[PDB]
Amino acid sequence: DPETAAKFKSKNAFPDPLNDPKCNPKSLVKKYLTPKVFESLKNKKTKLGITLWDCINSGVVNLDSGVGVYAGDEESYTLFGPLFDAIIEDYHSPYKLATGHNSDMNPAHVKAPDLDPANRYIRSTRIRVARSLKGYGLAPGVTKAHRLEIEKKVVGVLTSLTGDLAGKYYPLSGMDEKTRQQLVDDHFLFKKGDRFLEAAGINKEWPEGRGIYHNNDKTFLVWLNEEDHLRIISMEKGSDIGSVFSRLCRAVNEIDKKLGFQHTKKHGYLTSCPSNLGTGMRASVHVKIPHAKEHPDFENILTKYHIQARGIDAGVYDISNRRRLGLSEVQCVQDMYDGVKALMELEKEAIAKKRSVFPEVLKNPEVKSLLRKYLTPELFDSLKDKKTAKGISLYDCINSGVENLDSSCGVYAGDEECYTLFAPLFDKIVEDYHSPYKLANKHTSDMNPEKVDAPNLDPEGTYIRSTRIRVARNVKGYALTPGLTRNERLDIERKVVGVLSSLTGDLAGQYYPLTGMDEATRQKLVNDHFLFKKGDRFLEAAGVNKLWPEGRGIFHNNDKTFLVWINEEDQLRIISMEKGSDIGSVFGRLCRAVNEIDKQLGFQHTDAHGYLSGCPTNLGTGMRASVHVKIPKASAHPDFQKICDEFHIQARGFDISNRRRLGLSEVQCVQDMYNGVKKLLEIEKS
Ligand SMILES: Nc1ncnc2c1ncn2[C@@H]1O[C@H](COP(=O)(O)OP(=O)(O)O)[C@@H](O)[C@H]1O
Numbered sequence: 276d277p278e279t280a281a282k283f284k285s286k287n288a289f290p291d292p293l294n295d296p297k298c299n300p301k302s303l304v305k306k307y308l309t310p311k312v313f314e315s316l317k318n319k320k321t322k323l324g325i326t327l328w329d330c331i332n333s334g335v336v337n338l339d340s341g342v343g344v345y346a347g348d349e350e351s352y353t354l355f356g357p358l359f360d361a362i363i364e365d366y367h368s369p370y371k372l373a374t375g376h377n378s379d380m381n382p383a384h385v386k387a388p389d390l391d392p393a394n395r396y397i398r399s400t401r402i403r404v405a406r407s408l409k410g411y412g413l414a415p416g417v418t419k420a421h422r423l424e425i426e427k428k429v430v431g432v433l434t435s436l437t438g439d440l441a442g443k444y445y446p447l448s449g450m451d452e453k454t455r456q457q458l459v460d461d462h463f464l465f466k467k468g469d470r471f472l473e474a475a476g477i478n479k480e481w482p483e484g485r486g487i488y489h490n491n492d493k494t495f496l497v498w499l500n501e502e503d504h505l506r507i508i509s510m511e512k513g514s515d516i517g518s519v520f521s522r523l524c525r526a527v528n529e530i531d532k533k534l535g536f537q538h539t540k541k542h543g544y545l546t547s548c549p550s551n552l553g554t555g556m557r558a559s560v561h562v563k564i565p566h567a568k569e570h571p572d573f574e575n576i577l578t579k580y581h582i583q584a585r586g587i588d589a590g591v592y593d594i595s596n597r598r599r600l601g602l603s604e605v606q607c608v609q610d611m612y613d614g615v616k617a618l619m620e621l622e623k624e625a626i627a628k629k630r631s632v633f634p635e636v637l638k639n640p641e642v643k644s645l646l647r648k649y650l651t652p653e654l655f656d657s658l659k660d661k662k663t664a665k666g667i668s669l670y671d672c673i674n675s676g677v678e679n680l681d682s683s684c685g686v687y688a689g690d691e692e693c694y695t696l697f698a699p700l701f702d703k704i705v706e707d708y709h710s711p712y713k714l715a716n717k718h719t720s721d722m723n724p725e726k727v728d729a730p731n732l733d734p735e736g737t738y739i740r741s742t743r744i745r746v747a748r749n750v751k752g753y754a755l756t757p758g759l760t761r762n763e764r765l766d767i768e769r770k771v772v773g774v775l776s777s778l779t780g781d782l783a784g785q786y787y788p789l790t791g792m793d794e795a796t797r798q799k800l801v802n803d804h805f806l807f808k809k810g811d812r813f814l815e816a817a818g819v820n821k822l823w824p825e826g827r828g829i830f831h832n833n834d835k836t837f838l839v840w841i842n843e844e845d846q847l848r849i850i851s852m853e854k855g856s857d858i859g860s861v862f863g864r865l866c867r868a869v870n871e872i873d874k875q876l877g878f879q880h881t882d883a884h885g886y887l888s889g890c891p892t893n894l895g896t897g898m899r900a901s902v903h904v905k906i907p908k909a910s911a912h913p914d915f916q917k918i919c920d921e922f923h924i925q926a927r928g929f930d931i932s933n934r935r936r937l938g939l940s941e942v943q944c945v946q947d948m949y950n951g952v953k954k955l956l957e958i959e960k961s
Contacts, residue, residue, distance in 0.1 A: 277474060280335040284328045289313045290335040297338060304334035304343030307361040316358065321350040323416045329476065330355055330415075336474035342366060345475040345547045347416030349537055352545070363542075363549050363600075370601040376543040376553055379603035380531075382524045387517030387612045392760040393666065394821045396619050397514035398561040398591065402523050402608070405503040405546045405555035409535035414503055414547040415476040422484035425504050432533050433488045433497060440526055442490035447482035457793065463489055465501050477502060477547065493791075495522060503546050503555075505530070512822045513761040516560065520608050543600060553600030558611045565590025566625035567618045576621070580614030594618070630670045631659070634677045646676035646685035649703040658699065663692040667758050672697060675816035684708065687817040687889050689758030691879055694887070705884070705891050705937075712937040718885035718895050721940035722873075724866040729859035729949040733904075736855040738956050740903040743852040744861045744945070746869060747845040747888050747897035751877035755889040756845055757818040764826035767846050774875045775830045775839060782868050784832035786841075789824035805831055807843050819844060819889065837864060845888050845897070847872070858900070858952075862945050885937060895937035900948040902931035909958035922951035931955070 276292060283290050290313075292298070293305045308331060316327045325347030334343020344362060346352050352359050360372060391397040407413055408428065411421050430444050445454060458464035464487065468478045486499040498506035507530075509523035530536075537545035543553035567573060568590065577584060585593040594615055596607045633652040636642070650673065658669045667689035670677075676685020686704055688694055694701050702714060733739040749755055750770070753763050772786050787796060800806045806829065810820045830839040840848035849872075851865040872878075879887040885895035906929060909915055919926055923934045924947070931952060933944050 276338070277336050280332060280474075283335070284332065287317055287326075287328060290328075290331065292335055292338060299339050299341065302334065302338070302340055302343050303362045303365055304331055304340065304358075306365070307358055308334075312358055316355055319354055321348050321354055321416070323348050323350070323412045323418075325351050325412070325416045327355055327358070330358075332476070333471050333474040337471050340471065342548060342550055344549060345415050345477070346413050346545070346549065347476075348412035349539070349545055351413070351416070352539075352542060359549060363552065366550055367552070367598075367600040370553075372541045374601065375540050376600055377603055378538070378543055378554070379605040380524050380528055381605065382517070382521040384605045385517055385520055385608055385612075387520070387608070389515050389517065390612070390616055390619060391514035392762070393758070394513055394761055396562050396564070396622060397615070398563070398822070399510065399512050400514055400516045400519045400561075401508065401510035401559045402516070402519050403506060403508045403557045403559075404523065404527060404604070405544070405551045406505040406507060406527065406530070407537040407545050407547075408504050409537055411504070411537075413537075413545065414500070417479075417500075417504075419480055419483070422480065422500055426484045426486060426499055428534055429497075429499055429505065429530070430486070430488070432530050436490075436526065436529070439492055439522065440490050440495055442488055442495070444486055444488045446486040448485070458487065460793070461489075461493065461791075463487055463493075463496055465498055468502065472502060475547065494519075495526060497526075502548070503551070512825050514560070515761075516558070516608065516612055520558075551599065553598075554602070554604045554607050556599065556604050556607050557595055558608050559593055559595040560611065560615050561587060561591055562594055562615060562618070563590045564592055564618050564622050567621040568592070570621050570625070572621070573618075576614060576617050580610050580617065582611060582614040630668075634673075636677065636680060639680070642680050644676050644680070644682040644685040645704050645707055646673055646682060648707070650700055654699055658697055661696055663690055663696050665690050665692070665754050665758055667693055667754075669697050669700070671757070671818070672700075674818075675813050678816040679813050682813060684891065686891065687757045687819075688755050688887070688891070689818070689889070690754040691881070691887055693755075693758075694881070694884060701891065705894065708892060709894070709937040712895075714883045716938055717882045718937055719940050720880065720885055720896070721942040722866045722870055723942060724859070724863040726942045727859055727862060727945050727949070729862075729946065731857050731859070732949070732952060732956060733856040738905045738959055739856040739952065740905065741852065741855060742858050742861050742903075743850065743899075743901045744858075744865050745848065745850045745899045745901075746865065746941070747886070747893045748847040748849065748869070748872070749879045749887055749889075750846050751879050753846070753879075755879070755887065756842070757889045759821070759842075761822055761825070764822065764842055768826040768828065768841055770876055771839075771841050771847065771872070772828070772830070774872055778832075778868065778871070781832055781834055781864070782837055782871075784830055784837065786828055786830045788828035790827070800829060800831075803831075803835060805829055805835075805838060807840055810844070814844065817889070837868060839868075844890065845893065858902075858945060858949050862941075893936070895935075896939065896941045896944055898933070898936060898941055898944060900933045900945055902948065902952055904929055904931055904952065904956070906955055906959060908961055909955050912958055912961070914958070915955075918951065918954055922947050922954075924948065924951045 298305055320326050329347050330344050334340045467481055484500045488497040494511045496508040509519045544555045546555050581597050583597050596611050633655045637647045662668050671689050673686050676682040750767050809823050827842045836853050838850040851861045886897040925934050
């Protein structure tokens with residue numbers, strides 16, 4: 276009811292609408308703005324001309340207000356003290372203004388070893404602070420010129436930031452619809468203030484003087500002249516709150532050194548809304564704690580570390596500090612860290628207990644996964660307490676098969692060591708799926724295209740319609756896809772993109788990261804059938820979809836013959852494809868690119884398993900050679916089945932592909948693909 280409140284404001288009369296027609300019982304302005312308080316202060320004005328009615332207006336206009344007051348300037352907090360002091364000490368109880376507040380923005384005082392590098396629990400981390408500049412009023416009392424001055428001074432500081440803090444400023448006045456659309460996508464844009472901010476006078480001269488700064492990494496974000504002069508945000512996926520706090524402090528302290536902030540001993544940093552006083556800080560973490568949420572100690576942990584939990588997928592909560600006043604920013608972050616760590620240990624207890632016994636669901640005879648076939652309780656009990664150097668357990672490896680009972684295999688490797696440490700399971704699975712290959716036989720890799728003699732089969736394209744060869748590779752030195760930490764995944768993306776951008780000739784192309792993928796870029800790539808989406812339930816349970824879509828992307832050449840998927844199911848899925856028949860050309864292109872990547876980075880590889888992958892089906896050559904070919908006549912001939920078995924290739928309604936991956940080189944596999952097709956099309960002249 277803006278129109279009603281204006282009538283009282285125009286008379287400078289007591290705001291009757293506070294006398295609950297439908298006013299919030301908890302409303303602090305209703306509680307502390309009494310007739311005598313109003314009478315005592317209604318004629319007082321700050322140097323900036325802020326009145327009591329200016330400060331209380333939002334709370335009278337918006338009767339559902341929890342707080343209902345905004346300060347126009349620093350003087351408002353003293354001049355209208357009797358009102359603000361009561362509101363502050365009630366909202367921030369048991370804080371006492373007489374006690375005082377101590378700020379601390381030294382990140383070195385924070386002790387925060389990274390809680391969750393593997394991202395088993397924590398999804399994202401974010402720290403926000405609100406700050407106001409010296410020499411000016413607060414948001415409701417800022418003049419038109421002052422706001423422009425603030426924009427000018429802040430941008431000057433922000434545009435001179437270096438390192439990971441370097442970035443771009445986007446003012447709201449103007450902003451191409453293109454730019455706007457992009458910022459909405461990143462969730463970096465703020466809109467006109469809601470009814471609470473409107474009634475506080477915060478939307479004055481919208482959108483003049485308002486703007487957005489972000490660094491190139493998009494891990495640092497500043498809102499200029501929104502609810503306060505500055506809303507400064509440091510954030511990233513994963514759990515590294517110490518890193519997040521450090522980046523925040525570097526930027527905030529630099530701005531403070533050049534401009535200075537509004538700050539008192541009793542209020543801490545000054546903000547428009549009294550709720551944001553003190554640290555002006557909200558430190559936050561998104562974390563999956565379904566089991567901890569139901570533990571009886573849950574609420575007592577929140578109370579103990581002074582944190583709160585809010586609903587956001589399933590079991591994922593927003594954990595943030597409850598306190599602003601009476602504690603330092605350092606103490607606030609530390610309490611956040613300790614509370615989250617405590618809740619994480621709870622979650623780890625429940626999961627460890629549940630993983631301590633043999634998965635009873637595997638005892639069902641309707642389950643026909645390889646996991647069920649080979650994993651006995653005795654084998655489980657022999658392996659269950661063991662972990663690789665990266666902390667990968669047996670249960671980590673079989674999790675997808677236990678969560679998805681309809682798995683064909685159900686077992687993934689988090690790292691190379693899994694194939695050794697959990698050999699009594701992996702050996703059986705490998706030798707079963709890749710039967711009759713024996714691990715003792717060892718495997719020979721060979722990516723020399725000159726050792727293939729494959730003259731073109733069907734240059735008319737009479738039968739063969741297209742030729743596709745894919746290889747799966749993983750980068751040496753890292754875990755496999757299910758076991759990747761956040762930093763590993765990003766590091767792999769950076770290195771591979773660095774290599775792919777050095778590719779010349781017809782290998783030249785560019786990289787399309789899934790993160791920051793607009794609309795025009797997406798739907799296009801999809802038409803080419805180049806786009807890959809998020810993994811399914813099997814990959815999710817394996818740990819392949821962690822931090823999606825961070826670090827994922829697509830590279831293709833101009834001719835669209837050479838394609839690379841980065842950090843999908845394997846770290847590198849490399850595809851060469853074209854035309855109709857020339858198997859020898861596809862492979863030559865494939866080898867040129869793969870060998871160059873191999874030379875710069877290296878691949879995970881053993882004698883026994885060939886090229887390593889998270890999924891045992893992709894071992895050895897890690898290669899799929901496929902032929903699309905019209906063969907009506909030979910498919911019914913009594914030699915067709917003799918042929919497929921003799922050359923160990925499979926035919927599927929008419930996809931012609933290799934069945935073998937282990938115990939043969941890539942040269943040998945391609946040559947056999949050729950020869951098999953050669954005798955198949957041979958009958959297409961019966
Ligand atoms: N740890 C986090 N990771 C990612 N996003 C977050 C995190 N914490 C909060 N957010 C998002 O930031 C947005 C604004 O946060 P909000 O709860 O309004 O805090 P603030 O008062 O600092 O703006 C919300 O949409 C919320 O989903």
